[PDB]
């Protein structure tokens, strides 16, 4: 959900009874707050890795398994959020969410992460780059649930799963089980 | 903080139009009886008397439409916009036109004692003619910005009759010229011109008589005292208003239940001539 | 919806009635009987308006001794009967009509001094001997039949209330309707225009020394009207609250009811007043 | 309930030591003043000014030390035993002894206005031999029970100077007695004696010449005035510690906040006799 | 061990000191500044009490020259700069003492007047003139020097408060008690020494009416104290909070902080009152 401006009763304003509204000073700060039980879920992630016969690590623990953020200097789509919310394009620092779901003690630990939104994002399928209209005032919300992760699992001496921005796995996890026969 | 919050305590519902029906009493019977005895039957003293007559008759068209201002007080109206314009427009024209008056007495006053000897013909001309011009008619075309822009408008869970401003920059300007022509600008005059009264007399200690300014220095001090907080108040309000002195909402509902209950007892100007004149004081 | 629920009643009330009731107690006794036994029994006469500030005495003491009952029924409730509920109620409503009428009547007495000072010199002592009594004590009697009727003690939470009680709140409400219209407006009307015209017939005369004896019969109304008016506008604003006018302020319903309550207790200075007015002249 | 509890409120931790510290002043200023003109110098004309003399002594040794009173409404009584129980009979003591006198000096007008023939050496009789045995023999025969029950505790924290008994009764015992001798069986005799008073002076309204009798009916209606809503709290404290008017814990909280704003009121007494000297009232 | 339990709610003083303070500017500045108009610009002393209060309203103009910038201090926080602030800070100390001072010499004027009317007449015009300005002006300029050292303007969340500020509480200690010493304790001991002597020897007087000028400089200095003096108690219980004597009362402490705040606008008044009992007689 982005904030816009705050209202109140239209005009009213004279001699007796009179409000003053608060104006969004940054239009493009938005938030995210993903819910449910995201440990529970992350270590039966885990615990799936440590079933995969295709994991290298040592499957008789999980704690070793880490979900780790790409490097500095990388994409923004890579680093942080990208998501369509009803036209505009959110992009989410990734400290807070992945420490609190890491639980790494010593940082900023929180169940949300704070976005900002881009009029400039990234091609996933082809090589270029769109810019788009400055963002539309008032409210923007968007709800959905949460139902897979794209990501990059690493096998060495620890196990850093890296999360990357491969879109397309999305659609070959959903269309991975059918395939196109000919009689 | 979303926004500010309107929530009136509930002891200005009650103590509010209890002031408003005293007032109501007393200045229906004192003007009555003041209009009846003075300009009826025109038993004049002194030129000072017409202009006690003035204010007196502005007071009373004041007091027709102060119990609309007591139903506003703890209800909803259902009368109509043209109600709300009038008692607006009637409102302003009171509060400018009573400290005007109250100038133009302290002026001729000062014609009085300093301008004692070449001072018959002005003084009468001036009780005359002049202050026809002088008091309702840049009183009345103060009005128009009430009459022009002023409407009704629903809170939706209520009717409500008072200001509405294109801004709140309409609102801190016509308050800072209210204040202007209510208190300060007529408060520089008639101070100014006490102070070549009470000169005037120190060179004549000698022969006193009189006891006569009296009556018209309690009645300036009785109007400033009286008008002075519901200034202060709205001053108060302008400051926040222009946002100088934000302080959150709990100190913009305390204004403005201090600027209701000042205004409220502020309105003892009503209630300021014919008290004196039973006293003769 | 929203049911009566006042079940939150004061403290501070329950403190501060019984004080200003035992002090108006005190005043009323002493000053009541002081002036019933210089006047009354002693035949101490020297004016005809004196009459009529007896006949104020006499009910001033029909609300003095049974006054401490009203204090037990502001501390307790009633232990005592209710038979002696219905006494208190219809000598409270018979000395609450009879004050406002006797002063109704001595309206009308310097009425017809002043202005027929030449042809009423025996209607004067027909209207002090013959008329008067049928002109108050019987019309105040004969309004509390509902008074009698209505009255008794109800039964609560080991309370027994004493309190009158209706078959709906409209018997209620039209109860104190007919209560504050022939409680104020008709004894106000009539009292506001003999008291215009005895003005405006005073300003036929040049300032005379029959006008030095109208400042204590003045002093008397505003001093009644000034003490009787806040709980006349409670009691039309709590009347207004109920048969669905104003339904917002539940909160703002019982904060009414104290209100009402202390000033039905602050609105009994009138027997206090009326040795005062002996105490000064 | 849990159990009860002691608290005292914020607002009069502050506010009784400036009504305790100006009475103080005011008390010792206007004794001190009185003393010097009239006791040292012996330039007193009539009989009554001996018992303002006595009023007057009494005040002051009542006055000097309640600033004990004023350390201790806020802070701790370090002092002493003796101290608390030589403040607590002085106050009992100077309670009495006034009421005492200003029940003498209506006896004495009743002497004066009655008896103004018969009777010359009864004045200096009741003015010099029976003063001694009448006033101050019963006020220090009512004041055993404070030399010989009180005492200082450490309650938890607090170190209280403050009247103890051994249980509840004894409490009501003396406050009926207390109000029955302080305010009750005073209030029947000094109203009998002015009721005779003015029974006869309205005899003799064809010559009023002095009217001296002003001076005490201002003193006794102004005492009174500020005892009564003493009386009154201490009366419904008794009727709470007889449990027959229970409501709860926090009314006798209020109750006794009422207490401690009434005294302070009462102790307004003080500056009765001085200021009504210095007006020559 | 809460060091200071820092609170913001005086929402009700953030509006009642600014009215307070504007009512006591306007009064202050037209008394003053018409007092010295009549008094110093054309020398109209008729005793040399007169001198007294030119020196008095001097003072006083002194003081609503700057109450503008209290009532800024009040509402909102100080802008202004250190040196402004310790302008304000200065004159209100010199105001304060100044005050008192002049009037220990106006007591030690009637009391030289009343005393030694035959021997001590040249000596009368010696303090009237020559010692009276290295009595009152220059002492008080002496006692200035800790407001020029440690009051300034201090750090806040954009605030910068205009206040007193000392290292430790040792400062505080002794510079409020040296303040409340010389400001109560010797100017009372010589007012009420010396009045006590005037009036003792006024009773050898026979009754003469040369006490008739002895009234208007009683009822002065009886205003002035009543003036002062809930602050003089206020500062007391605010100094006596200190070294820990009372540690349990941190709200009781903010409720002194309050009560001194809305004493400092009470105590205020005695600006007015000087050219006040000159506007009655």
């Not at chain 1, 009803?86 to 010593?106: A, P, Q, S």
């Not at chain 1, 409210?139 to 999360?163: H, K």
């Not at chain 2, 000072?48 to 209800?75: E, N, Q």
């Amino acid at each position: 959900k982005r904030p816009g401006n705050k209202t109140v009763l239209p005009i009213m304003s004279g001699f007796k009874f009179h409000s003053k509204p608060v104006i969004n000073k940054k239009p493009r700060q938005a938030w995210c707050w993903f819910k449910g039980e995201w440990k529970e879920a992350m270590q039966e992630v885990k615990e799936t890795l440590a079933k995969h016969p295709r994991y290298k690590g040592n499957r008789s623990r999980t704690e070793n398994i880490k979900f780790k953020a790409p490097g500095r200097g990388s994409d923004p789509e890579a680093a942080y959020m990208w998501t369509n919310c009803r036209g505009e394009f959110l992009y989410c620092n990734m400290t807070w969410f992945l420490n609190w779901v890491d639980n790494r003690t010593g940082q900023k630990q929180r169940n949300y992460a704070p976005c900002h939104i881009r009029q400039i994002i990234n091609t996933w399928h082809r090589v270029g780059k769109n810019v788009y209209l400055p963002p539309r005032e008032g409210e923007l919300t968007c709800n959905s649930t949460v139902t897979s992760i794209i990501a990059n699992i690493d096998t060495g001496d620890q196990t850093d799963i890296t999360f990357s921005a491969e879109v397309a796995e999305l659609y070959r996890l959903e269309l991975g089980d059918y395939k196109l026969v000919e009689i | 903080e979303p926004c500010f919050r309107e929530e009136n305590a509930n002891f200005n519902k009650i103590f509010l139009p209890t002031i408003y029906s005293i007032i109501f009493l007393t200045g229906i019977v004192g003007n009555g009886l003041v209009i009846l005895v003075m300009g009826y039957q025109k038993k004049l003293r002194s030129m000072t008397d017409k202009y006690r007559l003035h204010l007196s008759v502005a007071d009373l068209l004041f007091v027709i439409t102060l119990p609309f201002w007591a139903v506003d007080a703890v209800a909803n109206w259902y009368f109509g916009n043209f109600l709300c314009k009038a008692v607006h427009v009637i409102y302003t024209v009171n509060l400018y036109s009573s400290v005007l008056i109250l100038a133009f007495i302290s002026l001729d006053r000062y014609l009085a004692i300093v301008h004692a000897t070449n001072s018959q013909r002005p003084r009468k001309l001036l009780a005359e003619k002049v202050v026809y011009v002088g008091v309702w008619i840049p009183a009345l075309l103060l009005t128009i910005p009430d009459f022009i822009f002023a409407n009704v408008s629903e809170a939706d869970d209520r009717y409500i009759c008072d200001r509405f401003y294109p801004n709140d920059l309409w609102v801190v300007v016509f308050q800072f010229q209210h204040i202007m022509v209510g208190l300060i600008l007529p408060g520089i005059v008639i101070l100014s011109c006490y102070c070549i009264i009470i000169s005037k007399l120190s060179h004549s200690k000698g022969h006193q008589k009189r006891k006569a300014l009296k009556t018209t220095v309690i009645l300036i001090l009785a109007f400033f005292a009286c008008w002075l907080p519901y200034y202060i108040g709205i001053s108060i309000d302008s400051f926040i208003l222009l946002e100088i002195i934000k302080q959150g909402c709990e100190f913009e509902n305390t204004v403005h239940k201090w600027i209701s209950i000042t205004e409220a007892l502020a309105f003892f100007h009503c209630c300021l001539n014919p008290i004196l004149y039973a006293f003769l004081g």
